[PDB]
Amino acid sequence: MAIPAFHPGELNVYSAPGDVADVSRALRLTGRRVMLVPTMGALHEGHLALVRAAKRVPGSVVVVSIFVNPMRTPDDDLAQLRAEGVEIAFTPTTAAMYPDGLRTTVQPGPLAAELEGGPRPTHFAGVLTVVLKLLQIVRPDRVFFGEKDYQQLVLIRQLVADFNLDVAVVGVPTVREADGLAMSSRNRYLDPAQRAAAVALSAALTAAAHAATAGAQAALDAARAVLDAAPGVAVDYLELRDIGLGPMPLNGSGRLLVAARLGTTRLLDNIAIEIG
Amino acid sequence: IPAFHPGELNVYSAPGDVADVSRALRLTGRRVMLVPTMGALHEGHLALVRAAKRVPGSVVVVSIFVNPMQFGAGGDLDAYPRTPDDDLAQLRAEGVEIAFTPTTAAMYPDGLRTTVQPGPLAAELEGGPRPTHFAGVLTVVLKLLQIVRPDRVFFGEKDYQQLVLIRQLVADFNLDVAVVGVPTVREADGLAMSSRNRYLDPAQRAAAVALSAALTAAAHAATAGAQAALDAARAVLDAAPGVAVDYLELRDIGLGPMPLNGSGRLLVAARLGTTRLLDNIAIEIGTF
Numbered sequence: 322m323a324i325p326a327f328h329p330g331e332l333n334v335y336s337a338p339g340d341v342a343d344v345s346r347a348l349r350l351t352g353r354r355v356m357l358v359p360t361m362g363a364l365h366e367g368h369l370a371l372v373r374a375a376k377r378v379p380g381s382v383v384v385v386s387i388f389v390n391p392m393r394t395p396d397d398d399l400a401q402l403r404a405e406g407v408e409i410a411f412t413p414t415t416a417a418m419y420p421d422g423l424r425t426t427v428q429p430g431p432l433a434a435e436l437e438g439g440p441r442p443t444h445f446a447g448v449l450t451v452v453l454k455l456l457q458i459v460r461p462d463r464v465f466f467g468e469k470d471y472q473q474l475v476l477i478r479q480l481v482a483d484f485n486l487d488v489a490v491v492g493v494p495t496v497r498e499a500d501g502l503a504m505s506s507r508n509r510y511l512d513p514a515q516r517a518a519a520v521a522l523s524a525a526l527t528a529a530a531h532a533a534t535a536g537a538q539a540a541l542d543a544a545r546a547v548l549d550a551a552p553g554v555a556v557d558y559l560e561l562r563d564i565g566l567g568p569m570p571l572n573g574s575g576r577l578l579v580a581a582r583l584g585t586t587r588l589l590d591n592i593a594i595e596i597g
Numbered sequence: 598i599p600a601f602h603p604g605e606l607n608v609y610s611a612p613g614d615v616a617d618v619s620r621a622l623r624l625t626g627r628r629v630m631l632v633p634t635m636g637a638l639h640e641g642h643l644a645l646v647r648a649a650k651r652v653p654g655s656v657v658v659v660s661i662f663v664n665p666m667q668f669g670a671g672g673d674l675d676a677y678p679r680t681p682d683d684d685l686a687q688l689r690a691e692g693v694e695i696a697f698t699p700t701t702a703a704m705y706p707d708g709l710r711t712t713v714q715p716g717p718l719a720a721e722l723e724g725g726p727r728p729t730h731f732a733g734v735l736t737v738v739l740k741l742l743q744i745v746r747p748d749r750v751f752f753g754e755k756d757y758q759q760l761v762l763i764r765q766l767v768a769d770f771n772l773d774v775a776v777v778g779v780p781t782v783r784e785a786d787g788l789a790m791s792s793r794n795r796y797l798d799p800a801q802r803a804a805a806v807a808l809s810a811a812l813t814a815a816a817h818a819a820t821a822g823a824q825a826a827l828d829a830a831r832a833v834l835d836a837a838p839g840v841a842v843d844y845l846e847l848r849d850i851g852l853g854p855m856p857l858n859g860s861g862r863l864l865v866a867a868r869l870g871t872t873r874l875l876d877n878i879a880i881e882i883g884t885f
């Protein structure tokens with residue numbers, strides 16, 4: 322019942338859930354507002370944008386979890402976080418996260434069966450289960466996700482509302498390459514022809530977002546034409562929904578989402594759309 | 598913060614109100630105890646409340662909510678006893694300071710959407726014929742725990758499979774609460790307390806003593822091993838007028854995927870007319 326060592330203003334690494342839970346609770350008692358940034362593999366600028374967002378809350382202490390599925394290299398990742406002034410990295414093993422194996426889990430609502438839930442019908446159960454655990458271990462005031470995985474973000478908001486969780490969910494605008502391609506660990510697999518064609522996803526969506534003054538059908542036809550101008554872009558879906566991913570209403574706010582396969586690589590993108 | 602009057606019973610229906618009060622209290626040093634109930638309070642519930650009040654510095658929150666999601670049927674949901682007036686009167690007499698009495702709309706404003714899927718235990722025993730019953734229980738318990746954020750949550754051992762699943766929920770989702778299991782309160786003859794005992798007619802009430810008789814006979818027979826324990830309990834249930842046994846199972850204490858060693862739980866469920874009764878007891882095998 323002694324609190325684990327915490328050195329303020331340094332990067333403190335913990336692998337044990339109980340240690341990070343004790344430190345986060347001790348920190349919340351001393352004033353600090355605990356921010357959580359969940360991550361998975363090699364850190365990229367997308368991830369750094371979540372960190373920076375969390376850093377700007379006055380009195381924040383930022384916790385970055387690094388944990389691979391059951392849903393890169395440790396050296397550089399940790400160097401990057403130190404550089405960002407992150408004070409806690411949580412790096413648990415699979416065994417420490419799942420000491421009893423897979424047992425009680427979260428069952429998403431029917432949204433999880435749609436869109437990405439078509440090829441990966443249990444994917445979102447995994448993500449929601451591990452999010453719930455990280456939220457209970459760290460007990461942050463705010464948790465930060467990219468808007469890139471939009472359906473994921475919406476399901477997370479559903480989790481927080483449905484299970485009455487305390488935490489504020491912050492969606493952070495997707496970081497993009499110079500030509501608009503949304504950042505993703507998958508981008509590096511693309512060969513040159515594929516990387517050149519992949520700019521069609523973001524170009525389609527931004528075209529649709531500007532075509533939308535002319536109504537929903539013009540937005541969708543614009544995105545579709547841009548996708549049709551690209552070779553080797555196999556479109557899995559292109560759907561305009563309302564902001565919670567229900568059916569898009571006659572006018573007002575929506576989201577347009579696309580997924581496509583370029584060779585063996587699946588890419589996704591989405592954008593805010595205002596109808597008329 | 599709504600009003601909170603200490604040494605009185607404060608009743609809140611809105612989850613935001615009880616959440617605000619509970620947080621406010623924990624931050625002034627009071628430890629928050631939660632006793633979840635479905636109302637129709639009996640002495641077994643008052644044992645939970647007493648256990649909670651005995652924790653130094655406690656404030657006791659008792660929830661009363663008949664959770665539609667854990668009911669199947671049928672007319673089971675509409676049939677559950679509701680005695681709101683006797684319930685709050687009991688809580689005032691026990692010196693409880695908070696009752697949380699949410700509406701169905703406040704708990705399920707989006708209907709059934711994200712839910713808890715229990716592990717494989719939920720498909721065994723009570724769950725075999727009621728495959729979504731324990732997903733409903735665990736989903737509600739998770740919500741009540743997030744709304745109230747108690748330090749310690751109290752459950753009877755009578756619904757032992759439920760208590761085991763609740764400890765699984767707490768371990769598997771890293772919940773910060775301690776689960777306290779309180780031994781079943783029984784009538785003078787041994788009959789386990791239950792909201793459903795009111796549906797036994799005089800003859801069924803007489804015959805219902807066989808469940809606890811059979812279990813206590815087994816716990817003592819158990820020096821002679823598992824088969825003798827099981828056969829003692831079966832003999833007693835067989836001797837009982839109009840008791841229809843649904844199962845009698847001797848399991849390891851976790852009810853889980855491990856064999857019985859020295860410590861077991863013997864569980865029984867039986868029908869007296871239309872009334873399903875459950876009971877269970879600790880069993881030590883042999884030299885235990």
Ligand SMILES: COc1ccc2c(c1)cc(CNC(=O)c1cc3ccccc3o1)n2CC(=O)O
Pocket residue numbers: 359360361362366367368370371448451452466467468469493494495496503504505506507
């Ligand atoms: C703000 O700009 C952007 C742009 C693209 C982004 C991100 C941010 C963040 C991500 C990837 N998501 C995670 O690492 C992640 C989510 C998650 C959920 C639960 C547990 C661990 C988790 O880890 N990507 C896309 C990607 O890398 O493919």
Ligand SMILES: COc1ccc2c(c1)cc(CNC(=O)c1cc3ccccc3o1)n2CC(=O)O
Pocket residue numbers: 633634635636640641642644645734737738752753754755756779780781782789790791792793
């Ligand atoms: C300490 O001695 C005993 C003996 C028998 C007991 C009890 C105590 C308590 C109960 C009934 N349980 C609830 O009302 C209840 C509500 C609830 C709500 C959410 C999660 C779990 C929940 O459990 N029974 C048995 C019964 O009444 O059939």
